[PDB]
Design a protein around this ligand. Sequence first.
Ligand SMILES: Cc1ccc(-n2nnc3c(=O)n(CC(=O)NCc4ccc5c(c4)OCO5)cnc32)cc1C
Ligand SMILES: Nc1ncnc2c1c(I)cn2[C@@H]1O[C@H](CO)[C@@H](O)[C@H]1O
Length: 350
Amino acid sequence: GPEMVRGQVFDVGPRYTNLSYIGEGAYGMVCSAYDNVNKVRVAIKKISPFEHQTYCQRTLREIKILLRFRHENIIGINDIIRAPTIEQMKDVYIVQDLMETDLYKLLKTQHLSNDHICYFLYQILRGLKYIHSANVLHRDLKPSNLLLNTTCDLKICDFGLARVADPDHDHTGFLTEYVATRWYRAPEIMLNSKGYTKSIDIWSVGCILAEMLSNRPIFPGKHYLDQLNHILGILGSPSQEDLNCIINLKARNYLLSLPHKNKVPWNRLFPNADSKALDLLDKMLTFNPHKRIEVEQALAHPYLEQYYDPSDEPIAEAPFKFDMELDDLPKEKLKELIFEETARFQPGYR
Ligand SMILES: Cc1ccc(-n2nnc3c(=O)n(CC(=O)NCc4ccc5c(c4)OCO5)cnc32)cc1C
Ligand SMILES: Nc1ncnc2c1c(I)cn2[C@@H]1O[C@H](CO)[C@@H](O)[C@H]1O
C-alpha cells in the first residue's frame, strides 16, 4: 500500500521511502525520507490547500518564487509530487534539502556566543539581500523560518506570504488585518502599512537579532494593539517628526492617545552584548520605516565586517514579476495554475 506516518498517508513512494516524522505547521506534516534516486535523506512537506482560497495563494506564490530562486541561504525545491490528473490532486508534496533544526528550536536549548550570533545574522542578511534584489519581500521572517544544521549553515524557508515589493500601494488604514506573526511585525503594520516595502523584513531581522542576544522575544505582544505598546515600550513614544510622517489621522490620534513612554537604552536592555551589534540593532529597529537601515547598509555595518564581501553575495538575475496576481483569482483557477506549475516534475514530460 501507500506509506504513511502518524495515521496519515504520505504518498511519496516508491522514490521516497523510510519516512520519519518531523513536525507540522502550515496545514502540512513535514517528514524526512530517503530519496532512493539521489541516495540521500530529504525533507518532504505535505500540503493540502485546495479547500481554502488563501492556502492556494500561499502555495502558488511559494512554489513560483522558490523555483525561481537559487541561493545558498534560501531553501530550494528539489521535487514536487502530485497526482497525474488534477481532480485526483488533493495533496502536494514539496521535496527540499533536509536541515537539522531551526533557530527557534536552537534558542530553546542554547545561549549563542557572539561569534555565532554575528555569523547567523550575516547569513540571514545575505539571503535577504538576494531576495530583496529580486524586489521580493519575505514578510514572515522569524526564528522558526530559519533552518540550520550543525555546520551552522542557515537557510530561509516558508515563502507563503512573500510578495513582490510595492511601495506605491503600501498605504492602508488604521487596524488593517494581518496574517504574519505578531511578535515580528513592524510598528507601521498596526498603523498604516500593508507590509509591501523592504523595511518590513528589516524590522523582523532586528527582532531576531534581539532574540539571539537574549533568548527572549523582544516584543511579545498578546493582541494586535498590545504589540504596538510593547514596541513603544522599548523605543519610547515616537518623535515629533516621526509622528507627522504618518498620513491618516486615525492612526496619528491613536498614537497621541497613548501615555508617554521612556526609551529604554539598548545597552541597558542588553548589557553584555557587543556594542557594534547594538548599534546595528538600533538602526534595524527604528520606528520610522523610511529611516530604517537597508539590507546592504546592514551588511556593510561594522558589526559584520569580518564577513561582508559583495563578491561572495549573489544577487538576482533581475526583478521578479508575477504575470498576474492571485488575491482575486478563485481557488479553482489557482489549483489549475498550481497544476501547470508542478507539471515539470511529473515523470515523463519534455
Ligand atoms: C552548548 C554549546 C555551545 C556552543 C556550541 N558550538 N557549536 N559550534 C560552535 C562554533 O563553531 N564556535 C566558533 C565560531 O564562532 N564558529 C563560527 C563559524 C563556523 C563555521 C564557519 C565560519 C564561522 O565561517 C565559515 O564556516 C563556537 N561554539 C560552537 C555547541 C554547544 C552544544
Ligand atoms: N527542510 C527542513 N529540514 C528540517 N526541518 C524542516 C524543514 C522544513 I521545509 C520544515 N522543517 C521543520 O518544520 C518546522 C518549520 O520550522 C520545524 O519543525 C522544522 O524543523
